[PDB]
Amino acid sequence: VHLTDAEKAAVNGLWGKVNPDDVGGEALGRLLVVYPWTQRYFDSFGDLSSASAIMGNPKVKAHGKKVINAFNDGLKHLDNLKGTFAHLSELHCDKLHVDPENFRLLGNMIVIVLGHHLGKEFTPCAQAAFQKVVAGVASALAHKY
Amino acid sequence: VHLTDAEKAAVNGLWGKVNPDDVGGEALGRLLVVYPWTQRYFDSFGDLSSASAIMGNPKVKAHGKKVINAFNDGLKHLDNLKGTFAHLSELHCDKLHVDPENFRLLGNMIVIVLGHHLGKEFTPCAQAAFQKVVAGVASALAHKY
Amino acid sequence: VLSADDKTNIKNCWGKIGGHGGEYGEEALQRMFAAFPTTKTYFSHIDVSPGSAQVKAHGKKVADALAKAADHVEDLPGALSTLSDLHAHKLRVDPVNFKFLSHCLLVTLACHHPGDFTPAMHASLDKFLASVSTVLTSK
Amino acid sequence: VLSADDKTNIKNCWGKIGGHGGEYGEEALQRMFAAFPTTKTYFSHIDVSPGSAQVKAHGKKVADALAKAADHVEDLPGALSTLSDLHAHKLRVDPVNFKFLSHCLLVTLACHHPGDFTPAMHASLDKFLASVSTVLTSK
Numbered sequence: 099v100h101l102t103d104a105e106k107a108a109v110n111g112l113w114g115k116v117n118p119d120d121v122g123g124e125a126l127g128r129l130l131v132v133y134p135w136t137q138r139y140f141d142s143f144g145d146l147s148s149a150s151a152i153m154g155n156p157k158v159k160a161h162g163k164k165v166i167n168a169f170n171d172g173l174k175h176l177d178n179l180k181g182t183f184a185h186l187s188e189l190h191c192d193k194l195h196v197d198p199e200n201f202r203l204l205g206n207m208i209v210i211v212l213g214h215h216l217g218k219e220f221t222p223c224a225q226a227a228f229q230k231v232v233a234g235v236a237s238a239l240a241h242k243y
Numbered sequence: 244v245h246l247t248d249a250e251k252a253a254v255n256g257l258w259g260k261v262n263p264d265d266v267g268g269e270a271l272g273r274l275l276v277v278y279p280w281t282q283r284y285f286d287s288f289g290d291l292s293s294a295s296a297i298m299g300n301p302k303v304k305a306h307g308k309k310v311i312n313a314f315n316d317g318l319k320h321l322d323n324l325k326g327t328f329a330h331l332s333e334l335h336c337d338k339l340h341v342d343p344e345n346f347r348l349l350g351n352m353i354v355i356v357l358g359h360h361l362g363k364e365f366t367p368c369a370q371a372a373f374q375k376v377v378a379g380v381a382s383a384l385a386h387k388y
Numbered sequence: 389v390l391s392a393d394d395k396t397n398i399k400n401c402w403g404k405i406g407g408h409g410g411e412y413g414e415e416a417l418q419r420m421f422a423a424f425p426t427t428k429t430y431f432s433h434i435d436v437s438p439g440s441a442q443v444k445a446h447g448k449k450v451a452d453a454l455a456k457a458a459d460h461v462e463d464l465p466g467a468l469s470t471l472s473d474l475h476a477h478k479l480r481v482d483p484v485n486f487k488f489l490s491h492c493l494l495v496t497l498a499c500h501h502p503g504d505f506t507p508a509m510h511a512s513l514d515k516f517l518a519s520v521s522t523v524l525t526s527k
Numbered sequence: 528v529l530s531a532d533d534k535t536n537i538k539n540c541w542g543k544i545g546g547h548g549g550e551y552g553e554e555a556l557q558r559m560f561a562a563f564p565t566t567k568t569y570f571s572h573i574d575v576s577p578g579s580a581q582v583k584a585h586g587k588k589v590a591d592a593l594a595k596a597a598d599h600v601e602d603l604p605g606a607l608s609t610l611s612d613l614h615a616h617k618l619r620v621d622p623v624n625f626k627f628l629s630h631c632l633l634v635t636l637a638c639h640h641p642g643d644f645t646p647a648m649h650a651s652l653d654k655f656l657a658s659v660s661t662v663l664t665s666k
């Protein structure tokens with residue numbers, strides 16, 4: 099991860115004005131709708147039968163908060179993405195058996211909820227800064243396979 | 244990388260009876276035929292217009308030797324796949340811009356040339372030992388993105 | 389696959405982009421060249437700096453093939469076969485690259501249409517650009 | 528895409544596996560369960576230990592759908608739509624998994640047919656199992 103100074107202030111500044119709780123529940127929300135094989139991994143969240151069922155579902159929102167707080171960690175400790183995510187990488191490998199391709203997929207869901215959310219402030223410059231982080235956060239969760 | 248003892252003797256024993264020079268030129272050979280977008284990356288090897296053109300081609304064979312000797316390193320230094328491949332990962336990223344998915348693809352070409360080559364000695368047990376190595380060798384070459 | 393719901397979701401969307409398709413396709417490219425500079429390699433022959441005139445021209449051309457596809461939703465190999473020999477055969481574009489441009493196209497639409505860019509819509513749209521990506525790499 | 532060369536390469540191959548298809552499909556599965564144990568998850572309900580009787584039964588069933596496809600090469604959605612709702616809709620199998628089984632199927636054929644498993648052949652075969660994978664995940 100590079101993350102230059104003007105590339106650093108774009109991230110923490112634009113992250114400034116998103117509600118993290120909704121970014122998380124909505125990204126997790128969208129992922130399951132756009133990629134329905136991801137529902138199998140979350141068999142424990144009740145039914146997920148339609149676009150509605152998987153959006154009012156309190157358990158999806160709840161999980162997507164635990165997701166966003168870890169992502170918030172990412173930002174705090176960009177020195178060591180791998181250290182921060184050592185435990186969680188182990189979890190998603192030894193006990194969940196999630197193919198790493200699924201990480202960049204969710205990464206992308208955060209990427210476009212941010213754009214959906216922030217409007218014409220999610221400039222190509224802003225996006226790129228976020229790309230490198232979500233990319234960094236993705237291979238962080240993969241280094242234990 | 245796990246690589247248990249009976250999983251270690253399967254690798255160095257079966258690698259025992261392959262000609263590395265042909266495994267390398269043939270895996271590189273097959274990759275370009277089965278995945279033709281990989282030819283763009285090797286624009287410098289003359290024409291690659293057909294199955295023949297890309298198999299008698301001395302430059303393909305030549306490159307596939309340099310590939311196999313690095314793979315041989317992998318085997319020698321399974322303690323540190325990442326250290327061994329630090330330089331080469333940098334090369335394939337900063338100067339070649341190769342999408343990491345292409346690594347597991349070539350990995351696979353070695354995987355089945357080995358099977359094609361060794362016959363009914365490439366047992367499911369043998370394959371698995373080789374999977375973990377070629378997999379290990381693949382994310383080794385990816386850790387600099 | 390594309391249901392009747394997918395078919396009609398698409399047409400509403402391209403009904404709404406109207407004549408912005410051009411500047412959208414520009415933005416999507418501009419977004420790809422920065423978030424995924426690996427792609428810049430395919431355009432060594434043109435100026436590519438953020439705001440630009442050759443990026444603008446290619447931009448419009450892209451969104452036209454998107455308009456075309458949306459029209460012939462049911463005959464995508466048919467409608468886009470001339471862009472198949474260009475990408476798959478002539479240029480040898482990596483099949484991973486189409487996932488980067490399709491994504492940046494979604495970030496573009498999502499940015500410009502918060503009201504319309506719902507989950508239900510967004511799946512159809514993804515799915516759509518996946519078969520547009522598929523046919524594009526079909527050879 | 529599949530050319531006439533691809534169509535006929537396939538039929539020769541399935542012409543040559545004859546009635547080994549069954550034991551081949553078994554071997555391919557046995558090869559998948561070991562090289563990619565992530566897959567074992569999808570078969571929690573059966574015995575899966577190296578040599579086995581339920582792995583043998585599923586094995587044959589697989590190779591039948593491969594025989595079927597090879598016959599209806601030109602109507603793959605048609606020939607295999609009943610296996611689409613099984614995998615895509617009922618089981619929610621990851622689309623990455625089909626790349627692991629297709630590979631192990633190639634290691635199986637390559638092992639048993641060194642004479643026939645040439646580069647030219649092997650591309651058609653890969654390409655074939657890619658559209659068999661595609662249709663399988665088509666929903």
Ligand code: HEM
Binds near residue numbers: 201
């Ligand atoms: C994008 C990066 C990801 C982050 C930051 C993340 C974060 C987390 C965290 C923090 C937990 C533990 C919750 C707790 O401590 O209470 C968790 C659990 C879990 N994650 Fe992820 N995750 C990511 C990717 C994924 C993806 C793509 C999947 C889809 C397969 C997934 C599937 C699961 C499952 C099945 C659990 C446990 C189930 C449960 O809590 O009921 N994760 N995740």
Ligand code: HEM
Binds near residue numbers: 281306345
């Ligand atoms: C499977 C793991 C791989 C290994 C072990 C490997 C090995 C090597 C080595 C050792 C060199 C330098 C040769 C020298 O020092 O003279 C090299 C160069 C190169 N590799 Fe790889 N490589 C791998 C994957 C790939 C893949 C998948 C591609 C396809 C995009 C690729 C494309 C290239 C190119 C374009 C060069 C330089 C071109 C040239 O030498 O003329 N590599 N590789």
Ligand code: HEM
Binds near residue numbers: 521
């Ligand atoms: C799936 C969405 C895409 C569409 C609808 C599309 C469509 C087009 C169109 C309309 C043209 C110009 C037609 C012509 O002048 O012949 C073109 C050219 C081209 N495309 Fe794309 N394309 C897509 C994806 C991509 C991707 C992902 C790449 C790789 C980054 C790519 C690389 C190129 C290149 C290198 C040219 C020629 C450049 C030039 O005009 O000099 N295309 N494409």
Ligand code: HEM
Binds near residue numbers: 569593618
């Ligand atoms: C592309 C090649 C494949 C073919 C031709 C194929 C075909 C079949 C056939 C013929 C059946 C049994 C039909 C029935 O009894 O209804 C079946 C069942 C099943 N398949 Fe596959 N399949 C393929 C790939 C996969 C993959 C990659 C997976 C995931 C690892 C998978 C998971 C399953 C499961 C879980 C069942 C039901 C198990 C049972 O019989 O109790 N399939 N498939």
